[PDB]
Assembly symmetry: none
Homo-oligomer: 81 residues x 10
């Protein structure tokens, strides 16, 4: 039985809301998931040498965001039967 | 029975809402998932040497966003039977 | 039986709300999950040498955000039968 | 039976709310989960040598955020049958 | 039977709330879970040598945030049958 | 010989101004004055010179 | 010979100004004055010079 | 020979200004004066010079 | 030969200003004066020079 | 030859200013004076020079 009223004014508002459910507001909100940020480096002689044989290798800079409902999520999987 | 009213004014508004469900608002909101950002580097002699044999190798800068419902999500998968 | 009223004014508002459920507000809120941030380095001679054989290797900078409902989540999985 | 009223004013407000449930507000709130931050380093000769054989190795800088409902979450899993 | 009233003023407010349940407010609140922060280092000769065989090794800087409902959460799991 | 490789430089920059107004009742009765109830994002960079107004929003100027 | 490799530089920068107003009743009755009830993000960078107003929002100027 | 590798530099920076106003009743009756009830984020960087106003919000100037 | 590798530098920085106002009744009756009831984040960096106002919010100036 | 590797430096920094006002009744009746009831975060860094006001909020100046 919600009721609002505003009479005999010069400016007037009358808002009436029987039921309300607000919602989510993201205002200027940031969100990082799996992020590499600002990696500086200074060197004179750099050498990277990977020697993989029948396996999984993951090197260097890397950012992985990964959702998996029904699977064996991984970043480097090696298997043998 | 929501009711609103505004009489005998010079300016007037009358809003009436029996039911409301707001929704999501993203206003100026950022979102990063699997991001590599701002990678500086200074060198004089750089050498990268990968020697892969029957395997999975993932080098260098990399950003992976990966959703997988019913599969073995990975970044480098090696397998043998 | 909510009721509001504002009479005989020069400016007037009348708000009436029988029921309310507010919602989530993210205003300028940040959120990091699995983040590598600001990695400096100074060297003269750098050498990285990986020698993987039938296994899983994960080196270098890395940021992993990983949700997994029904799977063996990992970052480096090795298996043998 | 909530009731509000404001009469014979020059400025007036009349708010009436029969029931209210506020919601969560994140205002300028930060949140880090699994973060590596600000890693400096100064060296003259750096050497990293990994020699993995049939196992799981996870080196270097790393940040892992990882939720897992029904799985053996890990960072480096090795197994044999 | 909550009731408010404000009559014969120059400025007036009348708020009436039959029931209220406030909500959580995070205002400028920070939160870290599994964080490595500010790791300095100065060296002349650095050497890291891992020799893993059929096992799990986790070295270097690392930050792990990890929730697991129904699984054997770990950081380095080794198993044999 | 300078070098800029991927460098950034922000001088006089307004960036990321969000704003929301939900169900906000508002009533104004202005008489010969200024009223400002709105967003206003202003940037400016003046190397030199004189009298460089970058924004004059919602004002009343009655000089003599 | 200088070098800038991925460097950043913010001089006079306004960044990330959020604002929300929910169900806020507001009533103003201004008479020959200034009223400001709104967001205002202003940046500025003046190397040299004179009289460089970057923003003059919602004012009343009656000089003589 | 200087070097900047991933360096940052903030000079005169306003950053991350959040604000919320929920169900806030507000009533103003201004007469020939200034009233400010709003967000205001101002940055500035002046190397040299003179009289560099960066923001003059919501004021009343009646000089003589 | 200097080096900056991942260095940071904040000079005159305002950072992270949160604010909430929930159900706050407010009533003002200003007459020829200043009233300020709002957020205000101001930064500034002036190397040299003179008379560099960075923000003059909500004031009343009646000189002679 | 200096080195900065991941160093930080805060000079004149305001950081992390939270504020909440819940159900706060407030009533003001100002007459020719100043009233300030709001947040105010101000930073400043002046190397040298003169007369560098960084913020002049909510005031009344009537000189002669």
């Amino acid at each position: 039985g919600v009721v609002a009223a505003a009479e005999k004014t010069k400016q007037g508002v009358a808002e009436a809301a029987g039921k309300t459910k607000e919602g989510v507001l993201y205002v200027g909100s940031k969100t990082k998931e799996g992020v590499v940020h600002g990696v500086a480096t200074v060197a004179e002689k750099t050498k990277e040498q990977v020697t993989n044989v029948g396996g999984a290798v993951v090197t260097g800079v890397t950012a992985v965001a990964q959702k998996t409902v029904e699977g064996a999520g991984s970043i480097a999987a090696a298997t043998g039967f």
